[PDB]
């Protein structure tokens, strides 16, 4: 078949009940995640092909970067709570990997301030139990899919994308294959 278990995707041996329909995991420290988001625009291209009523969810992971990695998971929870993911994704990726100006929790906060989030609003969110819950939710989801590495993407809590089984001849064809595989899986 054109789509094959073991080729473009794999099947979780322990499917996750109640998982977001399309769930991506990433780290702002992950070089492949930087390529996926800033050069290939994987997330945007997946979203443009999702069936009606299917949304993408993206969660950060703790296992890269020690202390700062966990600060970034908490800041990503702030971005999700405030609805500012689209304002901070590029400067967080660039701050960590391009300019390497993000070295502390305060430096993360500066990205939000420069993006127009008010200081009091950031600090209230950072310290909130809503954000504590969103950190726990990102951690629980990674545990539930037995996450090993990033980037990763999971569909319906049952299928894991396998980019290494896709055609990497051309970067844009690869992005197309990835997005079309997510759509195929969301309809399975």
Numbering used by the authors: 1 to 188
Manuscript text:
DsbA from E. coli K−12 (EcDsbA) was the first and is probably the best-characterised DSB enzyme to date. This 21 kDa periplasmic protein is a dithiol oxidase that catalyses disulphide bond formation between consecutive cysteines of unfolded polypeptides as they are translocated to the periplasm. EcDsbA consists of a canonical TRX domain, a hallmark of proteins involved in redox homeostasis, with an inserted helical domain. The acidity of this groove originates from a cluster of negatively charged residues (E24, E37, E38, D44, E85, D86 and E94) that map along a buried channel in the interface between the TRX and helical domains of EcDsbA.
The crystal structures of the three mutants containing the K58A mutation showed that the shorter alanine side chain at position 58 significantly expanded the size of the entrance to the buried channel. The binding of glycerol displaced w2 in all three structures and hindered precise analysis of the water network in these mutants. However, the double-mutant E24A/K58A yielded a rate constant of 1.47 ± 0.06 × 106 M−1 s −1, 35% slower than that of wildtype EcDsbA. Mutation of two or more of the E24, E37 and K58 further increased the “disordered” solvent content, reducing the structured hydrogen bond network between the charged residues and the w1–w4 water molecules. Indeed, both E24A/K58A and E24A/E37A/K58A mutants displayed significantly lower thiol oxidase activity compared to the wildtype protein (although the more reducing redox potential of the latter would also affect its oxidase activity). While native DsbA rapidly oxidised the substrate peptide (in less than 10 s), in the case of the DsbA double E24A/K58A and triple E24A/E37A/K58A mutants, oxidised DsbA was present in the reaction for over 10 and 20 s, respectively.
